[PDB]
Amino acid sequence: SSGLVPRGSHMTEGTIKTSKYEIIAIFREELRKRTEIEIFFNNTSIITQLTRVDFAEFHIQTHRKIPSGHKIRFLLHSDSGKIEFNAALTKHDNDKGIRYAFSLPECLQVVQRRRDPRFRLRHEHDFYCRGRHKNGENYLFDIKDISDGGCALMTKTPNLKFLSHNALLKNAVLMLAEYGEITIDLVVKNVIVITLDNANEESESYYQISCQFKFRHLDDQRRIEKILLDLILEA
Ligand SMILES: Nc1nc2c(ncn2[C@@H]2O[C@@H]3COP(=O)(O)O[C@H]4[C@@H](O)[C@H](n5cnc6c(=O)[nH]c(N)nc65)O[C@@H]4COP(=O)(O)O[C@H]3[C@H]2O)c(=O)[nH]1
Ligand SMILES: Nc1nc2c(ncn2[C@@H]2O[C@@H]3COP(=O)(O)O[C@H]4[C@@H](O)[C@H](n5cnc6c(=O)[nH]c(N)nc65)O[C@@H]4COP(=O)(O)O[C@H]3[C@H]2O)c(=O)[nH]1
Helix, strand or coil: CCCCCCCCCEEEEEECCCCHHHHHHHHHHHCCCCCCEEECCCCCEEECCEEECCCCEEEEECCCCCCCCCCCCEEEECEEEEEEECCCCEEEEEECCCEEEEEEECCCCEEEEECCCEECCCCCCCEEEECCCCCEEEEEEEEEEEEECCCEECCCCCCHCCCCCCCCEEEEEEEEEEHHHHEEEEEEEEEEEEECCCCCCCCCEEEEEEEECCCCCCCHHHHHHHHHHHHHCCC
């Protein structure tokens, strides 16, 4: 839409990686960046991180007991996109954490559909979105992340009746601290339940509202582009 495409996170609708070397280098970078990994089986997902990686296996550490028999599904929350694969269990021993070892996958799939990178607002930044629903009821949301094309809003107290898919939040106001305020339409793309971590070992539940910007004027888009560049370069 704008042409601006910073390096990192090139789009792919689905790229298959199969080289044992690259698969290892990828696991090593995501263990280091402490990337979130998500583990799915029998209709639910654990969520952990990697503990070590070598040339035949990767290792996690979870209080839950993971099954055995066949390969189970994984999803890495990588800055390159969602990295998915299947891996089988090979070792487990008995903080009462069960050490776990999985064979490295033979192939990974990378999917990166985001045309604009998303900046995650850290506790150094306190941005909000306020507005009025169609019935005049007021709302105020924390902004979790923001990109040239939209944002994710966090709240414990959504009014779900105004948050169906593609519902419009008309004349929301982004409150971006030193950057001022911008009035904007938001199209609701998704609503999920999320567990970020509060301070500090305590994990807490939030609703996450994924939104697309519908700009009022072309200059509002350019203004957001300048804010994101500032955010990225100053952190
Ligand atoms: N309709 C819609 N929903 C959105 C969008 N962005 C986030 N969500 C919802 O928010 C969930 C969490 O997103 P995430 O924390 O960034 O965590 C994501 C993210 O880390 C990653 N991921 C998935 N797809 C992509 C992608 O196309 N690009 C990138 N860079 N990462 C992706 O895998 C994790 C899980 O993905 P999901 O299972 O799909 O789960 C997503 C998804 O349900 C969006 O642009 N449109
Ligand atoms: N900062 C931020 N912006 C958001 C969020 N959700 C939506 N947007 C903005 O709204 C645009 C369109 O969302 P979409 O229709 O669901 O269309 C999305 C969606 O279908 C898909 N996608 C991207 N990431 C994910 C993901 O993590 N999970 C899933 N299930 N789909 C994703 O790729 C399409 C386009 O991605 P985008 O180019 O990034 O384009 C996004 C993005 O600019 C959000 O949680 N945070």
